[PDB]
Write an enzyme that holds these catalytic residues in place. Sequence first.
Site, PDB file in Angstrom:
ATOM      1  CE1 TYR A 302       5.554   1.237  -9.234  1.00  0.00           C
ATOM      2  CE2 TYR A 302       5.186   2.091 -11.450  1.00  0.00           C
ATOM      3  CZ  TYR A 302       4.864   1.196 -10.439  1.00  0.00           C
ATOM      4  OH  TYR A 302       3.868   0.271 -10.629  1.00  0.00           O
ATOM      5  CG  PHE A 305       5.167   7.490  -5.419  1.00  0.00           C
ATOM      6  CD1 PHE A 305       5.105   8.884  -5.276  1.00  0.00           C
ATOM      7  CD2 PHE A 305       4.141   6.850  -6.117  1.00  0.00           C
ATOM      8  CE1 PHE A 305       4.041   9.620  -5.833  1.00  0.00           C
ATOM      9  CE2 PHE A 305       3.074   7.589  -6.670  1.00  0.00           C
ATOM     10  CZ  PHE A 305       3.034   8.966  -6.526  1.00  0.00           C
ATOM     11  CE  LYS A 311       6.049   3.000   1.836  1.00  0.00           C
ATOM     12  NZ  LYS A 311       5.564   3.296   0.463  1.00  0.00           N
ATOM     13  CE1 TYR A 312       9.615   0.735   0.210  1.00  0.00           C
ATOM     14  CE2 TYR A 312      10.622   2.897  -0.097  1.00  0.00           C
ATOM     15  CZ  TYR A 312       9.665   1.956  -0.452  1.00  0.00           C
ATOM     16  OH  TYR A 312       8.776   2.222  -1.467  1.00  0.00           O
ATOM     17  CG  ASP A 397      -4.921  -8.547  -9.774  1.00  0.00           C
ATOM     18  OD1 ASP A 397      -4.534  -8.302  -8.605  1.00  0.00           O
ATOM     19  OD2 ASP A 397      -5.966  -8.068 -10.262  1.00  0.00           O
ATOM     20  CG  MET A 398      -2.892  -8.895  -4.932  1.00  0.00           C
ATOM     21  SD  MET A 398      -2.255  -7.784  -3.657  1.00  0.00           S
ATOM     22  CE  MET A 398      -1.206  -6.716  -4.658  1.00  0.00           C
ATOM     23  CD  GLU A 413       5.863   0.096  -1.423  1.00  0.00           C
ATOM     24  OE1 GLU A 413       6.347  -0.346  -2.489  1.00  0.00           O
ATOM     25  OE2 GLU A 413       6.475   0.885  -0.669  1.00  0.00           O
ATOM     26  CD  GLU A 422      -7.173   5.922  -1.301  1.00  0.00           C
ATOM     27  OE1 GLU A 422      -7.782   6.139  -0.228  1.00  0.00           O
ATOM     28  OE2 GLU A 422      -5.997   6.291  -1.510  1.00  0.00           O
TER      29      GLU A 422
HETATM   30  C1  LIG Z   1      -3.859   9.898   2.453  1.00  0.00           C
HETATM   31  N1  LIG Z   1      -4.993   8.966   2.535  1.00  0.00           N
HETATM   32  C2  LIG Z   1      -5.676   8.700   3.694  1.00  0.00           C
HETATM   33  O1  LIG Z   1      -5.447   9.185   4.785  1.00  0.00           O
HETATM   34  C3  LIG Z   1      -6.764   7.639   3.372  1.00  0.00           C
HETATM   35  C4  LIG Z   1      -6.396   6.349   4.137  1.00  0.00           C
HETATM   36  C5  LIG Z   1      -5.680   5.254   3.341  1.00  0.00           C
HETATM   37  C6  LIG Z   1      -6.437   3.926   3.357  1.00  0.00           C
HETATM   38  C7  LIG Z   1      -6.259   3.172   4.682  1.00  0.00           C
HETATM   39  C8  LIG Z   1      -7.030   1.848   4.704  1.00  0.00           C
HETATM   40  C9  LIG Z   1      -6.631   0.950   3.527  1.00  0.00           C
HETATM   41  C10 LIG Z   1      -6.792   1.689   2.195  1.00  0.00           C
HETATM   42  C11 LIG Z   1      -6.023   3.018   2.197  1.00  0.00           C
HETATM   43  C12 LIG Z   1      -8.182   8.131   3.739  1.00  0.00           C
HETATM   44  C13 LIG Z   1      -9.274   7.809   2.929  1.00  0.00           C
HETATM   45  C14 LIG Z   1     -10.571   8.113   3.329  1.00  0.00           C
HETATM   46  C15 LIG Z   1     -10.797   8.754   4.534  1.00  0.00           C
HETATM   47  C16 LIG Z   1      -9.727   9.096   5.340  1.00  0.00           C
HETATM   48  C17 LIG Z   1      -8.428   8.791   4.947  1.00  0.00           C
HETATM   49  N2  LIG Z   1      -6.581   7.508   1.928  1.00  0.00           N
HETATM   50  C18 LIG Z   1      -5.558   8.274   1.465  1.00  0.00           C
HETATM   51  N3  LIG Z   1      -5.080   8.425   0.244  1.00  0.00           N
END
Ligand SMILES: CN1C(=O)[C@@](CCC2CCCCC2)(c2ccccc2)N=C1N
Lengths: 615, 310
Positions: A302, A305, A311-312, A397-398, A413, A422
């Site tokens: 954590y 990351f 980012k923040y 859980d949301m 985030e 994902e």
């Molecule tokens: C680093 N990375 C990516 O670029 C991505 C997109 C994040 C994805 C965006 C939408 C909402 C959920 C998360 C990806 C996944 C599949 C194909 C192309 C990219 N997932 C990861 N881990």
Amino acid sequence: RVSSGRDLNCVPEIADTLGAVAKQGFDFLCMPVFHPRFKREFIQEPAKNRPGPQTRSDLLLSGRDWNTLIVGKLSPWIRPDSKVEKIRRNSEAAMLQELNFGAYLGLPAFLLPLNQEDNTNLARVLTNHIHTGHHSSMFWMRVPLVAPEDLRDDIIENAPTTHTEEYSGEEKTWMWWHNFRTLCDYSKRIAVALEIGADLPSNHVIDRWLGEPIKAAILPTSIFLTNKKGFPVLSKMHQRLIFRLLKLEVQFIITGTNHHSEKEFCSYLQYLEYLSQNRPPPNAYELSPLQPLMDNLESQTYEVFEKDPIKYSQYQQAIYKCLLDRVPEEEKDTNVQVLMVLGAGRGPLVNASLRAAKQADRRIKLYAVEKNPNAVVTLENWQFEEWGSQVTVVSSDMREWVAPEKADIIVSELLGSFADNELSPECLDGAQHFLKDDGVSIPGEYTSFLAPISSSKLYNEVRACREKDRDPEAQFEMPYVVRLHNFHQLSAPQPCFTFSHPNRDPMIDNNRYCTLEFPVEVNTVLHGFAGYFETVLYQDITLSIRPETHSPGMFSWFPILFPIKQPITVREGQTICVRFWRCSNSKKVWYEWAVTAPVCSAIHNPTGRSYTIGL
Amino acid sequence: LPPNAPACMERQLEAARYRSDGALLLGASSLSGRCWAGSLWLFKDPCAAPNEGFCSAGVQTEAGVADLTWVGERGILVASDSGAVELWELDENETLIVSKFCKYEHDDIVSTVSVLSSGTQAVSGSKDICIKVWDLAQQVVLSSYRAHAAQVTCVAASPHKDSVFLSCSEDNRILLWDTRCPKPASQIGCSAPGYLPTSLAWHPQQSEVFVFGDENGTVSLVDTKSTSCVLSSAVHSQCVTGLVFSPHSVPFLASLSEDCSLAVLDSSLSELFRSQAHRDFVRDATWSPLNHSLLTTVGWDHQVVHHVVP
Ligand SMILES: CN1C(=O)[C@@](CCC2CCCCC2)(c2ccccc2)N=C1N
């Protein structure tokens, strides 16, 4: 510093020669295990019954000296692909003799030459040596950037040198390495010892060696220029290659006699050390290559990351702008904006939301939602010691939490390489019910991108991830978190899928399918696809890991890699067609991908047999 | 034994050369064991060889000897493993072998050397694919040529021309050189590419014809003007390492090979004499200037055999 060695094809006294190269400043020595002119016979009498010894004793150097200071060299007379059967059969036995002796001494590396198109039998004898007893021994293949036939001086009267453009012909040395590497079944123990010539080839030839296992770089004394003082230097084009090779951390090898006789061999090494001490400056992003998507998430996981101030600061500016746009100066003290941090973690977004409210000078009521009870401990301790009644920590859980009131702004985030990132579309869909009809989601938009990549080094790293009690090819059907420095991009990234929050559709379907056609203008080998993403927090405030629109200072978000079981050969002018699916059940979310052009590949990860993310 | 001479001669004998007065020159290399260096030897008595205790002059070179050649009557040109071309001169009483120059110019092992007709210039072929023209008086490189694509196996200067010479390599090229041309090298030999050339020998009577040996054991006679191979013979079973012509008006061709045998051929390349006295690789051969029917051969078996050619 520069890890460097000296190449010598003449060693009369092994103790005196090693002392001379150590005085010059060399870390290791490339020398022959047997005399280069000592041609041995193994079948025909009476030369096969030659009295011994066949070479010098192993007692001449200590075990540590053979293991860390001496790199073996195959004798030049050994030609396992000779047109003469007698030379071929004799070279087979002599190669085995020299490879076995190199393993007996415990040498860290062994040099073998790739100086012709056909090395099929040299490949068999080496593949046989590797499959005969397990060893940590490495094999460096001596491959030139330009073949000596395409490097020779145009001095032959009835045989002139070709001046016409030959795009594929200029890359023939890479074909010598690739065909040999393929025959040896991509052995982890076979690497490249790239030999640099006097005149460098075109940019496409040098770019074909990107993503190849280069462990050594050979530099002859002939390629060195003489400056206005008498010291050995290198051309600006040769210097550009040294900077690229230093980033790949290759071991530089010096070969040939001292042409700068008024100086010494130490000056050749001093110039390479001068290049590393004065190389271009690195960035914050520059200060195992693949790691799978993390799902455990510890206190330190954590922490790394949370190590993203850029980012923040963007998240702070996004919330700060949303508050002023929602409540005017007349409603500064009478209107309280209810903020809901979904996936609060250890409180990095919560502190950023509080800093935004003080910056915008507007009233806020915070709710910190987090599923992980280990992270909830950090939030509840933060609340009691700093935040207070303003922040209401929720351990639920949301998607299942029953909120006491509707939200004005929902903040979420994606942190680091967390596998549940994902699931963001599904998590926000199950949380938008407790969001006001005019409510705002931060971020409001997510756009993913795909790009075709080439990396023979990364392909062999995925190939090594074979596990027992699972499919022997399951490792190729799962995504990996990789650095941008490793792979070589083949075409510009294209949009894969977009997610808008809040989702207004009456029939929301997070399932996706896209067909992306990538134009490739170079001769290459496709090993997989890199994934990047762009996010719109609020209006113009954005964050991106796409190479083109990349946010400077970001370190937490690394690109994702979707590999392919069998690598695909791609020619100049050809198009790479990728098919990508984002699949989602009522329990799991998984990715599926396939190649349809130039050649067809099998659909990767069907039904999520190798990889799935549980909701 | 003479002073400054090494105590023991190196096992592998690389070169054997006869001087105008009949003195034998020997080249020894240690291709195995603790030390991998070389040594130069002079023998006023030809039958005294290989005995170290009964030699005229001796010296130990920095590295192993690959090829040798006489530079008149006192000069000795050395092709060293260190990548240097060495010039060693004889004493006033010819009892010591002193080094004049040791210039490191070739990146890899110098495998072959040949002194040009003038006696002031010499050509050297090395494993670094390069060919260098040396100035024996000025001790410098006149021209550096990279015409080949593989290691240069043999370099042979023409009998009476300072600009003409032959060079062969593992790239299947037999190059006829002429420094008088803007492009000195010229690809000569057979029509279809066969087996790699390993040895070159210029004819002492016909300055337009020569002989070459391949890696399969075949010796071929070729005219530079005709440039079409017509006469060839399967002399040996292994690579032809050397070819030396007799001093006779009608010359005899001595063929050397790795099959541990020596062969003597006429002008039509027919077998006249064959010796299997050597139990190891036959490296060098020289016909005696006094007795034109006497031929001395050396090998890696430390044998200095004297043959009687009928
Ligand atoms: C680093 N990375 C990516 O670029 C991505 C997109 C994040 C994805 C965006 C939408 C909402 C959920 C998360 C990806 C996944 C599949 C194909 C192309 C990219 N997932 C990861 N881990």
